[PDB]
Paper text:
The same architecture is observed for TfQC, with an r.m.sd to PgQC of 1.1 Å for 286 Cα atoms. The only significant differences are seen in an altered course of the loop between α4 and βD (“4-D loop”, presumably due to the presence of TfPro171) and a lengthened loop connecting βD and α6 (“Tf insertion loop”, which starts with conserved residues PgAsp183 and ends with PgTrp193). A small degree of structural variation is observed between two sets of crystallographically independent TfQC monomers in the loop containing TfGly268-Gly269 that connects βG and α8, which was also observed for mouse QC (MmQC). Interestingly, two distinct conformations of the loop connecting α6 and βE (“6-E loop”) were observed in TfQC: the TfVal212–Pro213 peptide bond adopts a cis-conformation in two of the monomers as opposed to the trans-conformation found in PgQC, leading to an alternative orientation of α6.
Numbering used by the authors: 44 to 334
The structure:
């Protein structure tokens, strides 16, 4: 079917228009209703995991993991996921005055949700043969900031850790999983992420092959990228479900992400419909080609 990059663009704009999706803010709460409501409008049976999660600083985060289960009676299922919270710190900003102030997270948060929001629209209009679980993970981007010296493990991906050990349905199972992260920036290039190739090799090939078949090899690069801490690591760990990350890899930065990453430059100004189009068209092709 047709992926509407313009609609996925408006869904990103709608989230960011709330203000930053920082856990324990009202903008976060209004956005939680908005995301779950849209999933339900497009035929999903919606599950909201409310969990009080502890950030690196000991703060209790009132998180919502949002699960849209499509055709929930189908036993053969694919997991599509992304994080929806916005980081509380622009801790890589060039202005130190912004280091403890939140980011809009248009690309880091908004893009991966927005694409999956249009997917929900498309699969309500043309039901796929397989079941689809759309999962929006909370409290992914609240990890220890650069301006804190002490290291603690697993302070990122707080929501995906909870769900992976506490699924929304008992014995939840997916054939494989596809994570979308920072999938809207102008000039994005998604290299094959190392954790993905390790545990989801057959599906990295599935996604990268389909992407080139559709003409999106300029986006899905046939080369290896970084080893990345992301939500797909904790779903792999917890369910042993093979998961891949479609995540921007920027080889020119020290961090490996776009220059706006964890800055207040992560706004709608960077979102590229053609980047959105590539990712959305590719995933729609693969899921409808699952039997
Ligand atoms: Zn982030």
């Amino acid at each position: 079917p047709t992926f509407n990059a313009d609609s996925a663009y408006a869904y990103i704009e709608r989230q960011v228009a709330f203000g930053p999706r920082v856990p324990n803010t009202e903008a976060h709460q209004r956005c939680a209703d908005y995301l779950a409501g849209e999933l339900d409008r497009h035929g999903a049976k919606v599950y909201v995991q409310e969990a009080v999660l502890t950030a690196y600083n000991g703060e209790k985060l009132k998180a919502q993991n949002i699960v849209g289960a499509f055709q929930p009676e189908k036993s053969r299922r694919v997991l599509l996921f992304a994080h929806w919270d916005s980081r509380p710190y622009a801790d890589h900003d060039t202005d130190e005055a912004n280091h403890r102030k939140p980011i809009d997270g248009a690309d880091d948060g908004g893009s991966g949700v927005g694409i999956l929001l249009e997917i929900a629209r498309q699969i309500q209009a043309k039901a796929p043969a397989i079941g689809i679980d759309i999962v929006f993970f909370d409290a992914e981007d609240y990890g220890t900031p650069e301006f804190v010296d002490e290291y603690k493990p697993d302070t990122w991906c707080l929501g995906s850790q909870f769900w992976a050990k506490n699924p929304h349905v008992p014995n939840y199972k997916a054939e494989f999983g596809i994570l979308l992260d920072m999938v809207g920036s102008r000039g994005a290039t998604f290299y094959k992420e190392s954790t993905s190739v390790q545990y989801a090799a057959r599906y990295v090939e599935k996604v990268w092959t389909a992407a080139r078949e559709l003409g999106y090899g300029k986006y899905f690069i046939n080369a290896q990228g970084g080893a990345i801490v992301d939500d797909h690591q904790y779903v792999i760990q917890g369910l042993r479900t093979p998961c891949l990350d479609i995540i921007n890899y920027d080889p020119d930065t020290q961090s490996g992400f776009g220059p706006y990453w964890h800055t207040q430059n992560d706004t709608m100004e960077n979102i590229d419909r053609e980047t959105l189009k590539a990712v959305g068209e590719t995933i729609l092709n693969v899921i409808y080609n699952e039997k």
